[PDB]
Amino acid sequence: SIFIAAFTARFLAFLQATKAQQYVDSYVQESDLSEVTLPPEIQYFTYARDKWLPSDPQIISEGLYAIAVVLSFSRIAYILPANESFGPLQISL
Amino acid sequence: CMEKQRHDSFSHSRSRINAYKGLASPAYLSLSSEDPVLTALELSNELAKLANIEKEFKNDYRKLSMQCKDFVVGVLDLCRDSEEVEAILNGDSLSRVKLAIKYEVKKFVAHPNCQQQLLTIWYENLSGLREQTIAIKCLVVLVVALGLPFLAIGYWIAPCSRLGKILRSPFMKFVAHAASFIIFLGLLVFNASDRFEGITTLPNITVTDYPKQIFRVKTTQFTWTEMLIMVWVLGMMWSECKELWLEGPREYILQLWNVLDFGMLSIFIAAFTARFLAFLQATKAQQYVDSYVQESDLSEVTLPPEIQYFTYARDKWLPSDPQIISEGLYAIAVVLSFSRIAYILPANESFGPLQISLGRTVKDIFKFMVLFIMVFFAFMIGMFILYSYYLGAKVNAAFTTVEESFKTLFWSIFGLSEVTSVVLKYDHKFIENIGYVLYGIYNVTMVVVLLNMLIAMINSSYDDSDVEWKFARSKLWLSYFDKTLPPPFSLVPQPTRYQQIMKRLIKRYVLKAQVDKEND
Amino acid sequence: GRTVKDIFKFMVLFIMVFFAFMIGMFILYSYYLGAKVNAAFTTVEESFKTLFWSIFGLSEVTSVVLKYDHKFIENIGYVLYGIYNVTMVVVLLNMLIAMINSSYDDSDVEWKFARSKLWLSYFDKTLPPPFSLVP
Amino acid sequence: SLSRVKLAIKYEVKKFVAHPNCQQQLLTIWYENLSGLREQTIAIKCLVVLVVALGLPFLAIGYWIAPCSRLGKILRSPFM
Ligand SMILES: CC(C)CCC[C@@H](C)[C@H]1CC[C@H]2[C@@H]3CC=C4C[C@@H](OC(=O)CCC(=O)O)CC[C@]4(C)[C@H]3CC[C@]12C
Ligand SMILES: CC(C)CCC[C@@H](C)[C@H]1CC[C@H]2[C@@H]3CC=C4C[C@@H](OC(=O)CCC(=O)O)CC[C@]4(C)[C@H]3CC[C@]12C
Ligand SMILES: CC(C)CCC[C@@H](C)[C@H]1CC[C@H]2[C@@H]3CC=C4C[C@@H](OC(=O)CCC(=O)O)CC[C@]4(C)[C@H]3CC[C@]12C
Ligand SMILES: CC(C)CCC[C@@H](C)[C@H]1CC[C@H]2[C@@H]3CC=C4C[C@@H](OC(=O)CCC(=O)O)CC[C@]4(C)[C@H]3CC[C@]12C
Ligand SMILES: [Zn+2]
């Protein structure tokens, strides 16, 4: 479920990003985006890592993804009891 | 066997176990064949191998192997003359003792009747030194360490002399090897003298004896004690390669301690090879300077850069300079060379059992360290994936890379890493709080795994602790019974009488068993 | 008292391992006296000092890092320091286990024997040391 | 089918299931259709794990054609 949550948050961030990209490509015409001044709700998606809103969906995605990776490494418990030397150690643990 | 295996394989295995339980019986062992002690030893080895192979009836085969070992020890116990002890310890040289050491029969070798014979072989040609205190024997070690060159040259004339017999005794062989290793450690230490209180000149400064010479020639030249270390390592490597050629690579690699010894000697060889390459480059630069340029002092001259590089001080030095590799490998080799005390400690009465217990705990520590590695890699990858994007953002570059993440997570085991590792300069609280939580979970998990390791070792801890040490010491003795000079100086170039004794012993065993059975 | 009598042997083993690693780290870092950020392993005194205080976690991990851009020596310092810490932990655990095993009304009779020795020492020393000078 | 073994696992009867007479049967069911691989060392079995990890896409597509093949039986064994 935490993997699902991380990927859902990443997908929401991607949807917002591609909506901003669609707005930029649709309404404004120029050579480089940097010279242009954009509406702020759309311009926010041009900001770097530091500016990013604390509750950005991609921050949630990164955090949940790290937790999910740490937990996914725990699945070795389904595999260890088959071994002759690591089984009893897992039982005692 | 294939036909019996096709149908009722379980019954086939059960029949094999029944046949072996019949063969491993003391009754059939004693009354079956001539020389039943060898039969029982061989059957013990066979049953141990089949216990390792089957792995379902492992306990049955181990019980039968213990039966065979107990029969051998019981037959040995009944000896009440020196002739019978000698007859059991070697068949019609200590043959049965070697064969019981090979088959791991610990109570046969740690039995007083066997230990007394091994002790009279050990302290041969020097009877008085058996009863001296530990202080006097250690003092003898020191005396041999101080006088070993002289005794080395005297051993050439020794075979006629009585002192040659005194030196040829196994105890003096062991004392000579121990004093030799002591001299080796003393050389390793004394080579690092004149730096005990610190280097005198800063690494920025270059000091040379005469102006024309290159500074690297001064830095990489072989001092006398270093050449002595080189010939020493060559001698040890010769001995080890000789035993490798004899026993063969397959059997040689099996013992892990022999692999450690080979690696230590190889690392010494690597350090000296790198030092020699640096010295060759330095002397080539010196030869260029002396050949092509003419001046009073080298400092005033401007040289080609490839040759001039060898005039640089410590700081300028290329990161992959061969002498840096030499220093690193030499430090590792010294640290590993100090570990050779394991070849010497089992002879002692007070330090032997401690070494045995330490070895056992290490054998369990390996498995618990494997679990440590699994958990540690889990958390390392988690923290790296979390904090890698914030390289410039973090106040302390702790989890920004996989190297730094491994570093800080390892040093967190010993509490030597700060808690300010996870805090961010940026105003993101979700990532920083998840870092807090993951770091805390990691610390708690490491503590739990350590506690589980300690408990498992305590439970696995339980006169077997005495017989294991006596077995290790007896292996140490037999290694010297039949290696005369230390590595540095080893470079220079009517049934039968036995059938009567065995019949008497087996009669005693059968009678004792029948009396013990009827009495109960 | 019994635990101390075993602690002596395990401290002898401690001393062997500690001297091994002390000489190793000294031979490694002695050439970098001005180079190291912290003069930890530059001399045998400082090396003994930092390796002893590492047992109690009171010595920093910035001991082994260099100011100079040599990574081989600094990484070997990292590895040797980590191996030393792990080895000290293993020897401590082995000491604890050996003492636990050696721990087993004998504990009562040993104390009563010690107390009876204390008593017989006073059965037949009348005045304390300060006032036992007067004759 | 191992009915009593399943029912003893459900009722937590540990010595019935850990008995050699039961373990031998569970082992002959476990290493089914591959008899030789029972005695190989741990290194070789772990190497088999690595081989399967490298070749799993191909064996996945081959399992569709496998039920007729003998390799399908090799793959259908519980150990594989
Ligand atoms: C059995 C399976 C289907 C369980 C899967 C559960 C998820 C479908 C739910 C449970 C928790 C939910 C998440 C809780 C936290 C967030 C934070 C949220 O971040 C914001 O939208 C705030 C910023 C903004 O205004 O956009 C994004 C949705 C997300 C991932 C939610 C998406 C839907 C999630 C992943
Ligand atoms: C590279 C390391 C330090 C990071 C952690 C790796 C582990 C997350 C994984 C990678 C490979 C896995 C191993 C792959 C091989 C096996 C097979 C399996 O053991 C057996 O084959 C049992 C033998 C039998 O079947 O009778 C389970 C343990 C083990 C070691 C696995 C344990 C978990 C391991 C070590
Ligand atoms: C059984 C015995 C013979 C084993 C001995 C092995 C050595 C002969 C081999 C194994 C590893 C080798 C070493 C691996 C690392 C290096 C680094 C290398 O450094 C460089 O040359 C890089 C800088 C430069 O360009 O010169 C010097 C050679 C050396 C010591 C190699 C020399 C030959 C070594 C010591
Ligand atoms: C100065 C110290 C703190 C640094 C480490 C020294 C050790 C690396 C070496 C130096 C002298 C060695 C000792 C020299 C004397 C012996 C002889 C030997 O013990 C016996 O003689 C056994 C008695 C017997 O033969 O029955 C092995 C242990 C011991 C203490 C050696 C153990 C290893 C020692 C202590
Ligand atoms: Zn046959």
Q: 3-state secondary structure string, B81-147?
A: CHHHHHHHHCCCCCHHHHHHHHCCCHHHHCCHHHHHHHHHHHCCCCCHHHCCCHHHHHHHHHHHHHH
Query: Within an 8 Å CB–CB cutoff, is residue A78 touching chain B?
Result: no
Please give the single-letter amino acid code of residue C41.
F
Q: What are phi and psi of B507, to 5 degrees?
A: -65, -45
Neighbours of A28 (CB within 10 A): 13
Q: Roughly how many angstroms between the first and final C-alpha of chain A, as a whole number?
A: 26
Q: Which chain D residues are closer than 8 Å to B57 by Cβ? A: 20
Task: Decide if B456 contacts B94 (C-beta within 8 A).
Answer: no
Q: Which residues contact B41 (CB under 8 A, 6 or more apart)?
A: B68, B72, B96, B99, B100, B103, B105
Q: Chains B, D: CB contacts under 8 A, how many?
A: 13
Task: Decide if B380 contacts B405 (C-beta within 8 A).
Answer: yes
Q: How far apart are CA D29 and CA B40, in angstroms?
A: 36
Helix (H, G, I), strand (E, B) or coil at B394: strand
Taking Cα atoms as reference points, which of B283, B307, B282, B279 lies closest to residue B293? B307
Q: Cβ–Cβ of B10/D24 closer than 8 Å?
A: yes
Neighbours of B366 (CB within 10 A): 9
Helix-then-strand count for chain B, H and E: 23, 0
Neighbours of D2 (CB within 10 A): 13
Method: cryo-EM
Instruction: Give the ranges where B388-485 is alpha helix by DSSP (H).
Output: 402-411, 429-460, 464-481
Q: What are the structure tokens assigned to B153, written together? A: 């040259």
Query: Within an 8 Å CB–CB cutoff, is residue C85 touching chain B?
Result: yes
Query: Within an 8 Å CB–CB cutoff, is residue D24 touching chain B?
Result: yes
DSSP percent split of chain B into helix, strand, coil, nearest 5: 75, 0, 25
Q: What are the structure tokens assigned to B317, written together? A: 């030095």
Among the bound ligands, the one closest to the CA of B129: 4
Who lines ligand 3 at CB under 6 A? Answer: B 266, 269-270, 273-274, 277, 320, 322, 325
Q: How far apart are CA B209 and CA B286, in angstroms?
A: 13
Q: Which chain B residues are closer than 8 Å to A6 by Cβ? A: none
Among the bound ligands, the one closest to the CA of B271: 3
Q: How far apart are CA B383 and CA B399, in angstroms?
A: 6
Q: Cβ–Cβ of B324/C72 closer than 8 Å?
A: yes
Q: What are the structure tokens assigned to A74, written together? A: 């725990």
Q: How far apart are CA B336 and CA B193, in angstroms?
A: 20
Please give the single-letter amino acid code of residue B403.
E
Q: How far apart are CA B68 and CA B112, in angstroms?
A: 19
Task: Decide if B215 contacts B206 (C-beta within 8 A).
Answer: yes
Helix (H, G, I), strand (E, B) or coil at B419: coil
Q: What are the structure tokens assigned to D51, written together? A: 């081989």
Q: How many CA atoms lie within 13 A of B4 on its CB side?
A: 8
Nearest by CB to B195, which of C30, C57, C93?
C30
Identify the burial level of B163 via C-beta atoms within 10 angstroms of its C-beta, where 0-12 means exposed, 13-18 middle and 19 or more buried.
middle
CA C1 to chain centre: 18
- Checking chain D for breaks where C and the next N are over 2.5 Å apart, the residues before them are none
Surface of B (180-209) touching C: CB under 8 A: 188-189, 192, 195-199, 202-204
Taking Cα atoms as reference points, which of B215, B210, B137, B124 lies closest to residue B178? B137
Query: Per the annotation, does B251 bind a ligand?
Result: no
Q: Which helix (H) or strand (E) holds D8?
A: helix D3-10
**Alpha-carbon distances, residue C76 vs B416, C56, D65 (angstroms):** 18, 22, 54
CA angle D2, D4, D8 (to 5 degrees): 120
**Alpha-carbon distances, residue B25 vs B31, B52, B65, B67, B69 (angstroms):** 10, 21, 10, 7, 11
**Closest residue, chain B, to A86 (C-alpha):** B367
**Alpha-carbon distances, residue B77 vs B70, B89, B110, B121, D31 (angstroms):** 10, 12, 11, 20, 46
Contact exists between B and C (3 or more beta carbon pairs < 8 Å)? yes
Please give the single-letter amino acid code of residue B497.
R
What is the phi-psi region of residue B313: left when phi exceeds 0, alpha when psi lies from -120 to 50, beta otherwise? beta
Q: Which residues contact B351 (CB under 8 A, 6 or more apart)?
A: B345, C9, C12, C13
Who lines ligand 2 at CB under 6 A? Answer: A 76, 79-80, 82-83; B 373-374, 377; D 42, 45-46, 49
Neighbours of B143 (CB within 10 A): 13
Contact exists between D and C (3 or more beta carbon pairs < 8 Å)? no
Q: Which residues contact B194 (CB under 8 A, 6 or more apart)?
A: none
**Alpha-carbon distances, residue A2 vs A64, B303, C39, D70 (angstroms):** 6, 66, 48, 41
Q: What are phi and psi of C127, to 5 degrees?
A: -115, 150
- In sequence order, the β-bridge partners of residue B282 are none
Q: How far apart are CA B324 and CA C70, in angstroms?
A: 8
Neighbours of A69 (CB within 10 A): 20
For residue C36, the 8-state DSSP code is B
Distance A11 CA to ligand 1 centre (A): 10
Helix (H, G, I), strand (E, B) or coil at B280: helix
**Alpha-carbon distances, residue A84 vs A89, B63, D47 (angstroms):** 10, 20, 17
Please give the single-letter amino acid code of residue B44.
S
Q: Is the dihedral of CA A7, A8, A13, A14 positive or negative?
A: positive
Q: How far apart are CA C127 and CA D80, in angstroms?
A: 87
Task: Decide if C33 contacts C39 (C-beta within 8 A).
Answer: yes
Among the bound ligands, the one closest to the CA of B237: 3
Q: Which residues of B392-409 are buried (b: 16+ CB within 10 A; e: fewer)?
A: ebbeeebbbeeebbbbbb
Distance B54 CA to ligand 2 centre (A): 23
Distance from CA of B198 to the nearest CA of A (A): 47
- Return the residue in B373, B376, B434 with the most chain A beta carbons within 10 A, the one to mutate for interface testing: B434
Q: What are the structure tokens assigned to B493, written together? A: 């170039």
Query: Per the annotation, does B306 bind a ligand?
Result: no
Neighbours of B462 (CB within 10 A): 9
Q: Chains A, B: CB contacts under 8 A, how many?
A: 65
Neighbours of B215 (CB within 10 A): 19
Taking Cα atoms as reference points, which of C84, C89, C116 lies closest to residue B332? C84
Taking Cα atoms as reference points, which of B450, B386, B448, B446 lies closest to residue B421? B386
Task: Decide if B435 contacts B383 (C-beta within 8 A).
Answer: yes
Give chain D's length. 80
Ligand 1 within 6 A of CB of A8 = yes
Cα-Cα-Cα-Cα dihedral of B225, B228, B233, B238, to 10°?
180
**Alpha-carbon distances, residue B307 vs B203, B276, B469, D23 (angstroms):** 20, 18, 60, 74
Q: Which chain D residues are closer than 8 Å to B9 by Cβ? A: 24, 28
Taking Cα atoms as reference points, which of B502, B510, B508, B467 lies closest to residue B105? B467
Give chain A's length. 93
Q: Which residues contact C96 (CB under 8 A, 6 or more apart)?
A: B454
**Alpha-carbon distances, residue C9 vs B159, B175, B350, C15, D61 (angstroms):** 41, 22, 8, 10, 64
Q: How far apart are CA B433 and CA B424, in angstroms?
A: 10
Please give the single-letter amino acid code of residue B16.
R
DSSP output for B18-65: HHHHHHT-HHHHHHHSSSHHHHHHHHHHHHHHHHHHH-SSHHHHHHHH
Taking Cα atoms as reference points, which of B39, B44, B115, B103 lies closest to residue B79? B115
Q: Which chain D residues are closer than 8 Å to B10 by Cβ? A: 21, 24-25
Q: Which residues contact C97 (CB under 8 A, 6 or more apart)?
A: B357, B361, B454, B457, B458, B461
**Closest residue, chain D, to B10 (C-alpha):** D24
Q: Which residues contact B463 (CB under 8 A, 6 or more apart)?
A: none
Taking Cα atoms as reference points, which of B30, B26, B32, B38 lies closest to residue B92? B38
Q: What are the structure tokens assigned to D72, written together? A: 């399908």
Task: Decide if C121 contacts C113 (C-beta within 8 A).
Answer: no
Q: Is the dihedral of CA B9, B14, B17, B18 positive or negative?
A: negative
Whose tokens are 């004998």? That residue is C106
Query: Within an 8 Å CB–CB cutoff, is residue B327 touching chain C?
Result: yes
Taking Cα atoms as reference points, which of B414, B408, B406, B413 lies closest to residue B380? B406
Helix (H, G, I), strand (E, B) or coil at C66: strand
Query: Within an 8 Å CB–CB cutoff, is residue B407 touching chain C?
Result: yes
Task: Decide if A53 contacts A60 (C-beta within 8 A).
Answer: no
Q: Rounded to the nearest 10 degrees, what angle do helices A57-72 and A2-27 cross at?
A: 150
Neighbours of B57 (CB within 10 A): 21
Q: What are phi and psi of C120, to 5 degrees?
A: -60, -25
Surface of C (34-73) touching B: CB under 8 A: 34-35, 42-45, 57, 60-61, 68-73
Q: What are the structure tokens assigned to B274, written together? A: 């790198």
Nearest by CB to C43, which of B196, B202, B354?
B196
Taking Cα atoms as reference points, which of D28, D22, D24, D27 lies closest to residue D9? D22
Q: What are the structure tokens assigned to A43, written together? A: 């311009």
Query: Within an 8 Å CB–CB cutoff, is residue C81 touching chain B?
Result: no
Neighbours of B197 (CB within 10 A): 12
Q: What are the structure tokens assigned to C2, written together? A: 């019994």
Distance from CA of B434 to the nearest CA of A (A): 6
Neighbours of B302 (CB within 10 A): 7
Helix (H, G, I), strand (E, B) or coil at B207: coil
Q: Rounded to the nearest 10 degrees, what angle do helices B36-54 and B497-519 cross at?
A: 70
For residue B221, the 8-state DSSP code is P
Q: How far apart are CA B33 and CA B55, in angstroms?
A: 30
Q: What are the structure tokens assigned to C86, written together? A: 């792990």
Q: What are the structure tokens assigned to B293, written together? A: 């340029």
Surface of B (304-323) touching C: CB under 8 A: 314-315, 317, 319-320
Q: What are phi and psi of A47, to 5 degrees?
A: -75, 155
Task: Decide if C72 contacts B325 (C-beta within 8 A).
Answer: yes
**Closest residue, chain A, to B426 (C-alpha):** A50
Taking Cα atoms as reference points, which of B14, B107, B94 lies closest to residue B68? B107
Q: How far apart are CA B160 and CA B64, in angstroms?
A: 52
- In sequence order, the β-bridge partners of residue C36 are C66
- Return the residue in B330, B349, B414 with the most chain C beta carbons within 10 A, the one to mutate for interface testing: B414
CA C92 to chain centre: 10
Instruction: Give the ranges where chain A is alpha helix by DSSP (H).
Output: 2-27, 40-43, 57-72, 87-92
